[PDB]
Protein backbone atom coordinates (compact mmCIF):
# COMPACT_ATOMS: atom_id res chain seq x y z
CA UNK A 1 0.00 0.00 0.00
CA UNK A 2 1.01 3.63 -0.53
CA UNK A 3 1.10 6.83 1.52
CA UNK A 4 1.71 10.53 0.89
CA UNK A 5 4.35 12.64 2.59
CA UNK A 6 3.70 16.36 2.18
CA UNK A 7 5.97 19.34 2.74
CA UNK A 8 3.85 22.39 3.62
CA UNK A 9 4.82 23.79 0.22
CA UNK A 10 2.51 21.42 -1.62
CA UNK A 11 5.29 19.15 -2.88
CA UNK A 12 3.53 15.80 -2.46
CA UNK A 13 5.69 12.66 -2.51
CA UNK A 14 4.30 9.14 -2.90
CA UNK A 15 5.92 6.40 -0.80
CA UNK A 16 5.15 2.68 -0.75
CA UNK A 17 5.27 1.32 2.80
CA UNK A 18 3.46 -1.38 4.79
CA UNK A 19 1.69 -0.85 8.17
CA UNK A 20 4.24 -2.83 10.22
CA UNK A 21 7.11 -0.47 9.44
CA UNK A 22 8.85 1.79 11.94
CA UNK A 23 8.96 5.56 11.53
CA UNK A 24 12.72 5.15 11.01
CA UNK A 25 12.05 3.19 7.81
CA UNK A 26 9.74 5.87 6.42
CA UNK A 27 12.31 8.53 7.30
CA UNK A 28 14.96 6.51 5.49
CA UNK A 29 12.80 6.24 2.37
CA UNK A 30 11.89 9.94 2.31
CA UNK A 31 15.52 10.95 2.73
CA UNK A 32 16.60 8.41 0.10
CA UNK A 33 14.20 9.93 -2.43
CA UNK A 34 14.95 13.58 -1.61
CA UNK A 35 18.31 13.76 0.18
CA UNK A 36 17.40 14.95 3.68
CA UNK A 37 19.59 14.08 6.66
CA UNK A 38 17.90 11.29 8.69
CA UNK A 39 17.93 13.28 11.94
CA UNK A 40 16.55 16.46 10.37
CA UNK A 41 13.24 14.76 9.58
CA UNK A 42 10.28 15.08 11.94
CA UNK A 43 7.14 13.44 10.57
CA UNK A 44 3.89 14.92 11.87
CA UNK A 45 0.39 13.50 11.43
CA UNK A 46 -2.66 15.25 12.91
CA UNK A 47 -0.43 17.56 14.95
CA UNK A 48 1.56 14.89 16.78
CA UNK A 49 5.21 13.99 16.23
CA UNK A 50 5.84 10.39 15.21
CA UNK A 51 8.26 8.49 17.47
CA UNK A 52 11.14 6.83 15.60
CA UNK A 53 10.75 3.56 17.50
CA UNK A 54 7.05 2.95 16.86
CA UNK A 55 5.34 1.85 13.64
CA UNK A 56 2.72 3.29 11.29
CA UNK A 57 0.23 0.65 12.40
CA UNK A 58 0.41 1.95 15.97
CA UNK A 59 -0.97 5.25 14.68
CA UNK A 60 -3.47 3.52 12.38
CA UNK A 61 -2.31 5.15 9.14
CA UNK A 62 -4.77 4.46 6.31
CA UNK A 63 -4.26 4.17 2.57
CA UNK A 64 -3.01 7.54 1.30
CA UNK A 65 -2.94 9.33 4.65
CA UNK A 66 -0.97 12.58 4.59
CA UNK A 67 2.16 12.52 6.76
CA UNK A 68 3.31 16.15 6.81
CA UNK A 69 7.05 16.80 6.92
CA UNK A 70 8.82 19.15 9.33
CA UNK A 71 12.59 19.68 9.24
CA UNK A 72 14.71 19.87 12.39
CA UNK A 73 17.96 21.77 11.76
CA UNK A 74 19.33 20.93 15.21
Amino acid sequence: MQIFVKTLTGKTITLEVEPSDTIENVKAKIQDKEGIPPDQQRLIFAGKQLEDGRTLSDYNIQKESTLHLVLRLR
Binding site: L8, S20, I44, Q62, T66, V70, L71
Partner: protein, 317 residues
Amino acid sequence: YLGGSLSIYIKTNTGRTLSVNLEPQWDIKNVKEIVAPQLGLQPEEVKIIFAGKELSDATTIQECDLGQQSILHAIRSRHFFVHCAQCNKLCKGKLRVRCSLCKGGAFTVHRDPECWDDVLKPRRITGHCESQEIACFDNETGDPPFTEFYFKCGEHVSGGEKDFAAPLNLIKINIKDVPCLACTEVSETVLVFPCESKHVTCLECFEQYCRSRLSERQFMPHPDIGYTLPCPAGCENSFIEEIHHFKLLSREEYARYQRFATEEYVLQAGGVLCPQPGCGMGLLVEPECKKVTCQNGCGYVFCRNCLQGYHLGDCLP
Protein backbone atom coordinates in the same frame (compact mmCIF):
# COMPACT_ATOMS: atom_id res chain seq x y z
CA TYR B 1 -30.43 -10.44 -3.67
CA LEU B 2 -28.48 -9.25 -6.71
CA GLY B 3 -26.59 -12.49 -7.26
CA GLY B 4 -26.96 -14.44 -4.04
CA SER B 5 -24.18 -16.77 -5.12
CA LEU B 6 -20.91 -16.20 -3.26
CA SER B 7 -17.32 -16.74 -4.46
CA ILE B 8 -14.59 -17.52 -1.92
CA TYR B 9 -10.85 -18.20 -1.91
CA ILE B 10 -9.34 -20.91 0.30
CA LYS B 11 -5.71 -20.83 1.49
CA THR B 12 -4.40 -24.08 3.03
CA ASN B 13 -1.33 -24.83 5.13
CA THR B 14 0.51 -25.56 1.87
CA GLY B 15 1.05 -22.77 -0.65
CA ARG B 16 -1.85 -23.75 -2.90
CA THR B 17 -4.91 -21.47 -3.18
CA LEU B 18 -8.34 -22.82 -4.14
CA SER B 19 -11.12 -20.73 -5.72
CA VAL B 20 -14.55 -22.14 -4.83
CA ASN B 21 -17.99 -20.54 -5.15
CA LEU B 22 -21.01 -21.71 -3.15
CA GLU B 23 -24.63 -20.89 -2.29
CA PRO B 24 -24.98 -19.03 1.05
CA GLN B 25 -27.15 -21.78 2.62
CA TRP B 26 -24.87 -24.84 2.53
CA ASP B 27 -23.77 -26.57 5.74
CA ILE B 28 -20.20 -26.00 6.90
CA LYS B 29 -20.00 -29.77 7.37
CA ASN B 30 -20.94 -30.00 3.70
CA VAL B 31 -18.27 -27.41 2.92
CA LYS B 32 -15.83 -29.65 4.78
CA GLU B 33 -17.04 -32.60 2.68
CA ILE B 34 -16.35 -30.41 -0.37
CA VAL B 35 -12.89 -29.15 0.60
CA ALA B 36 -11.81 -32.66 1.63
CA PRO B 37 -12.16 -34.21 -1.84
CA GLN B 38 -10.78 -30.97 -3.30
CA LEU B 39 -7.29 -31.60 -1.91
CA GLY B 40 -7.75 -35.31 -1.23
CA LEU B 41 -7.92 -35.15 2.56
CA GLN B 42 -10.46 -37.19 4.51
CA PRO B 43 -13.76 -35.47 5.43
CA GLU B 44 -13.22 -36.28 9.10
CA GLU B 45 -9.82 -34.58 9.12
CA VAL B 46 -10.76 -31.05 8.08
CA LYS B 47 -11.12 -28.22 10.57
CA ILE B 48 -12.16 -24.90 9.03
CA ILE B 49 -11.04 -21.53 10.41
CA PHE B 50 -12.40 -18.06 9.64
CA ALA B 51 -11.69 -14.83 11.54
CA GLY B 52 -10.35 -16.91 14.44
CA LYS B 53 -13.25 -19.16 15.44
CA GLU B 54 -13.39 -22.90 14.82
CA LEU B 55 -16.36 -22.95 12.45
CA SER B 56 -19.48 -24.83 13.49
CA ASP B 57 -20.18 -27.68 11.07
CA ALA B 58 -23.92 -26.96 11.04
CA THR B 59 -23.92 -23.16 10.76
CA THR B 60 -25.07 -21.50 7.54
CA ILE B 61 -22.54 -19.91 5.17
CA GLN B 62 -24.59 -16.70 5.09
CA GLU B 63 -24.48 -16.56 8.90
CA CYS B 64 -20.72 -15.93 8.92
CA ASP B 65 -21.01 -12.21 8.06
CA LEU B 66 -19.05 -12.94 4.89
CA GLY B 67 -18.59 -10.67 1.88
CA GLN B 68 -17.23 -11.48 -1.58
CA GLN B 69 -13.89 -13.01 -2.62
CA SER B 70 -13.09 -13.55 1.05
CA ILE B 71 -10.82 -16.26 2.47
CA LEU B 72 -11.36 -19.31 4.71
CA HIS B 73 -8.79 -21.92 5.77
CA ALA B 74 -8.70 -25.65 6.55
CA ILE B 75 -6.42 -28.25 8.17
CA ARG B 76 -6.16 -31.99 8.82
CA SER B 77 -6.19 -32.41 12.61
CA ARG B 78 -8.78 -34.91 13.82
CA HIS B 79 -22.76 -3.96 13.99
CA PHE B 80 -19.27 -2.53 13.54
CA PHE B 81 -18.40 0.82 11.94
CA VAL B 82 -15.35 1.71 9.84
CA HIS B 83 -14.25 4.39 7.38
CA CYS B 84 -13.10 3.23 3.95
CA ALA B 85 -10.74 4.99 1.56
CA GLN B 86 -12.76 3.78 -1.43
CA CYS B 87 -16.12 4.36 0.26
CA ASN B 88 -16.28 7.91 1.65
CA LYS B 89 -19.41 7.22 3.68
CA LEU B 90 -18.67 4.98 6.66
CA CYS B 91 -19.64 1.34 6.13
CA LYS B 92 -20.45 -1.67 8.30
CA GLY B 93 -17.12 -3.26 9.18
CA LYS B 94 -15.99 -6.86 9.58
CA LEU B 95 -13.29 -8.05 11.98
CA ARG B 96 -10.40 -10.29 10.94
CA VAL B 97 -7.17 -11.34 12.67
CA ARG B 98 -3.45 -11.71 11.89
CA CYS B 99 -0.44 -13.37 13.53
CA SER B 100 2.14 -10.90 14.83
CA LEU B 101 5.24 -12.99 14.08
CA CYS B 102 4.63 -14.23 10.52
CA LYS B 103 2.11 -11.53 9.54
CA GLY B 104 -0.39 -14.17 8.45
CA GLY B 105 -3.83 -15.43 9.42
CA ALA B 106 -5.68 -18.68 10.15
CA PHE B 107 -5.02 -18.96 13.91
CA THR B 108 -7.27 -19.76 16.89
CA VAL B 109 -8.11 -17.05 19.45
CA HIS B 110 -8.50 -17.93 23.13
CA ARG B 111 -11.14 -15.51 24.48
CA ASP B 112 -13.37 -14.47 21.55
CA PRO B 113 -14.72 -11.14 22.94
CA GLU B 114 -18.24 -10.14 21.91
CA CYS B 115 -18.43 -6.35 22.15
CA TRP B 116 -17.78 -3.38 24.47
CA ASP B 117 -14.53 -5.04 25.53
CA ASP B 118 -10.87 -4.36 26.23
CA VAL B 119 -9.28 -4.23 22.78
CA LEU B 120 -7.02 -2.24 20.39
CA LYS B 121 -3.83 -2.86 22.40
CA PRO B 122 -0.68 -4.48 20.88
CA ARG B 123 -0.48 -7.05 23.68
CA ARG B 124 -3.60 -9.09 24.46
CA ILE B 125 -3.73 -12.80 23.55
CA THR B 126 -1.45 -15.50 22.08
CA GLY B 127 -2.72 -18.21 19.72
CA HIS B 128 -1.57 -21.25 17.74
CA CYS B 129 -0.68 -20.67 14.07
CA GLU B 130 -1.06 -23.05 11.11
CA SER B 131 1.44 -21.46 8.71
CA GLN B 132 5.07 -22.64 8.62
CA GLU B 133 4.15 -26.00 10.20
CA ILE B 134 3.24 -24.43 13.55
CA ALA B 135 6.48 -22.49 14.02
CA CYS B 136 5.03 -19.33 15.54
CA PHE B 137 6.84 -19.45 18.88
CA ASP B 138 7.29 -16.78 21.55
CA ASN B 139 9.03 -19.20 23.94
CA GLU B 140 12.40 -18.28 22.42
CA THR B 141 11.78 -14.56 21.97
CA GLY B 142 10.91 -13.66 25.56
CA ASP B 143 9.57 -10.33 24.32
CA PRO B 144 5.87 -11.21 23.80
CA PRO B 145 4.13 -10.48 20.45
CA PHE B 146 0.38 -11.17 20.16
CA THR B 147 -2.52 -11.96 17.82
CA GLU B 148 -3.69 -8.61 16.45
CA PHE B 149 -7.05 -7.65 14.95
CA TYR B 150 -8.00 -5.50 11.96
CA PHE B 151 -11.12 -4.30 10.13
CA LYS B 152 -12.42 -4.48 6.55
CA CYS B 153 -15.14 -2.58 4.66
CA GLY B 154 -18.13 -4.87 4.15
CA GLU B 155 -20.01 -2.88 1.51
CA HIS B 156 -17.80 -3.91 -1.41
CA VAL B 157 -15.36 -6.42 -2.90
CA SER B 158 -12.21 -6.79 -0.79
CA GLY B 159 -8.60 -7.94 -1.05
CA GLY B 160 -8.38 -10.56 1.67
CA GLU B 161 -4.69 -10.48 2.52
CA LYS B 162 -3.94 -6.85 3.41
CA ASP B 163 -7.11 -4.76 2.98
CA PHE B 164 -7.97 -2.68 6.03
CA ALA B 165 -9.92 0.36 7.20
CA ALA B 166 -10.09 2.85 10.06
CA PRO B 167 -12.31 1.65 12.94
CA LEU B 168 -14.58 4.36 14.38
CA ASN B 169 -15.24 3.03 17.88
CA LEU B 170 -17.38 6.03 18.91
CA ILE B 171 -20.11 5.38 16.35
CA LYS B 172 -23.04 3.17 17.38
CA ILE B 173 -26.47 2.11 16.14
CA ASN B 174 -29.16 3.90 18.16
CA ILE B 175 -30.42 0.87 20.08
CA LYS B 176 -32.45 2.89 22.59
CA ASP B 177 -33.73 5.62 20.24
CA VAL B 178 -31.55 8.25 21.90
CA PRO B 179 -31.95 11.77 20.45
CA CYS B 180 -29.00 13.73 19.10
CA LEU B 181 -28.09 16.61 21.40
CA ALA B 182 -27.64 19.13 18.59
CA CYS B 183 -30.94 18.58 16.76
CA THR B 184 -33.12 16.54 19.16
CA GLU B 185 -33.63 14.26 16.16
CA VAL B 186 -33.37 10.51 16.77
CA SER B 187 -30.95 9.15 14.16
CA GLU B 188 -30.50 5.42 13.55
CA THR B 189 -26.72 5.81 13.33
CA VAL B 190 -25.11 8.14 15.87
CA LEU B 191 -21.84 8.95 17.65
CA VAL B 192 -21.27 8.53 21.38
CA PHE B 193 -19.05 11.10 23.12
CA PRO B 194 -16.47 9.89 25.71
CA CYS B 195 -17.79 11.99 28.62
CA GLU B 196 -19.57 10.60 31.68
CA SER B 197 -22.98 11.90 30.59
CA LYS B 198 -22.57 9.93 27.34
CA HIS B 199 -23.68 12.81 25.11
CA VAL B 200 -24.54 11.71 21.57
CA THR B 201 -24.63 13.42 18.17
CA CYS B 202 -25.76 12.35 14.70
CA LEU B 203 -23.54 12.52 11.62
CA GLU B 204 -24.88 15.79 10.15
CA CYS B 205 -24.06 17.53 13.42
CA PHE B 206 -20.67 15.86 13.68
CA GLU B 207 -19.90 17.34 10.26
CA GLN B 208 -21.35 20.80 10.95
CA TYR B 209 -19.69 21.03 14.38
CA CYS B 210 -16.33 19.94 12.94
CA ARG B 211 -16.39 22.20 9.87
CA SER B 212 -17.49 25.09 12.10
CA ARG B 213 -14.71 24.55 14.63
CA LEU B 214 -12.22 23.99 11.80
CA SER B 215 -11.90 27.23 9.80
CA GLU B 216 -10.68 29.12 12.87
CA ARG B 217 -8.15 26.54 14.12
CA GLN B 218 -10.29 25.81 17.19
CA PHE B 219 -9.32 22.15 17.67
CA MET B 220 -8.28 21.63 21.29
CA PRO B 221 -4.67 20.39 21.61
CA HIS B 222 -3.72 17.27 23.62
CA PRO B 223 -0.10 15.99 23.32
CA ASP B 224 -0.89 12.27 23.30
CA ILE B 225 -4.35 12.42 21.80
CA GLY B 226 -3.64 14.92 19.02
CA TYR B 227 -5.55 17.99 17.85
CA THR B 228 -9.05 16.81 18.70
CA LEU B 229 -12.42 18.22 19.70
CA PRO B 230 -14.01 18.76 23.12
CA CYS B 231 -17.54 17.62 23.96
CA PRO B 232 -20.31 19.67 22.30
CA ALA B 233 -21.32 20.55 25.87
CA GLY B 234 -17.63 21.02 26.66
CA CYS B 235 -17.48 18.23 29.24
CA GLU B 236 -14.09 17.70 30.88
CA ASN B 237 -11.75 14.92 29.72
CA SER B 238 -13.98 14.10 26.75
CA PHE B 239 -11.47 14.42 23.92
CA ILE B 240 -11.81 12.05 20.95
CA GLU B 241 -8.74 9.86 21.49
CA GLU B 242 -8.85 8.32 18.01
CA ILE B 243 -8.71 11.07 15.41
CA HIS B 244 -9.74 9.04 12.34
CA HIS B 245 -13.42 9.85 13.04
CA PHE B 246 -12.77 13.20 11.33
CA LYS B 247 -12.72 11.22 8.08
CA LEU B 248 -16.52 11.47 8.05
CA LEU B 249 -15.78 14.76 6.30
CA SER B 250 -14.48 14.60 2.72
CA ARG B 251 -11.09 15.38 1.14
CA GLU B 252 -10.92 19.14 1.66
CA GLU B 253 -12.57 19.26 5.10
CA TYR B 254 -10.24 16.59 6.50
CA ALA B 255 -6.93 17.17 4.73
CA ARG B 256 -7.16 20.77 5.92
CA TYR B 257 -7.54 19.37 9.44
CA GLN B 258 -4.27 17.52 8.89
CA ARG B 259 -2.54 20.64 7.54
CA PHE B 260 -3.74 22.94 10.32
CA ALA B 261 -2.82 20.36 12.95
CA THR B 262 0.71 20.19 11.55
CA GLU B 263 1.05 23.99 11.36
CA GLU B 264 -0.13 24.52 14.93
CA TYR B 265 2.16 21.75 16.17
CA VAL B 266 5.11 23.49 14.53
CA LEU B 267 4.03 26.84 15.98
CA GLN B 268 3.61 25.72 19.60
CA ALA B 269 6.68 23.46 19.71
CA GLY B 270 8.82 26.52 18.98
CA GLY B 271 9.20 25.96 15.24
CA VAL B 272 8.82 28.75 12.68
CA LEU B 273 6.99 28.83 9.31
CA CYS B 274 8.41 29.96 5.95
CA PRO B 275 7.71 33.62 4.99
CA GLN B 276 8.41 33.11 1.27
CA PRO B 277 5.00 32.78 -0.42
CA GLY B 278 3.52 29.30 -0.84
CA CYS B 279 6.16 27.57 1.26
CA GLY B 280 4.80 27.45 4.81
CA MET B 281 7.65 25.09 5.69
CA GLY B 282 7.89 24.57 9.44
CA LEU B 283 11.51 24.44 10.59
CA LEU B 284 12.20 23.50 14.21
CA VAL B 285 15.32 25.58 14.85
CA GLU B 286 17.31 25.01 18.05
CA PRO B 287 16.00 27.66 20.52
CA GLU B 288 19.33 29.51 20.79
CA CYS B 289 20.13 29.59 17.06
CA LYS B 290 18.70 32.68 15.36
CA LYS B 291 19.80 32.19 11.76
CA VAL B 292 16.91 30.69 9.86
CA THR B 293 17.48 28.71 6.66
CA CYS B 294 14.95 26.77 4.60
CA GLN B 295 16.10 23.14 4.57
CA ASN B 296 15.52 21.68 1.11
CA GLY B 297 13.48 24.71 0.11
CA CYS B 298 13.56 28.43 -0.64
CA GLY B 299 16.69 29.11 1.44
CA TYR B 300 15.46 32.56 2.48
CA VAL B 301 17.02 33.75 5.73
CA PHE B 302 14.87 35.71 8.20
CA CYS B 303 15.57 37.05 11.70
CA ARG B 304 12.50 35.27 13.17
CA ASN B 305 12.12 38.27 15.50
CA CYS B 306 10.93 40.41 12.58
CA LEU B 307 9.82 38.04 9.80
CA GLN B 308 11.98 40.02 7.37
CA GLY B 309 15.17 39.48 5.37
CA TYR B 310 18.31 38.48 7.25
CA HIS B 311 19.54 41.63 8.97
CA LEU B 312 22.68 41.94 11.09
CA GLY B 313 21.41 44.93 13.06
CA ASP B 314 18.50 44.41 15.45
CA CYS B 315 15.04 44.94 13.97
CA LEU B 316 13.59 47.97 15.75
CA PRO B 317 10.34 48.51 13.80
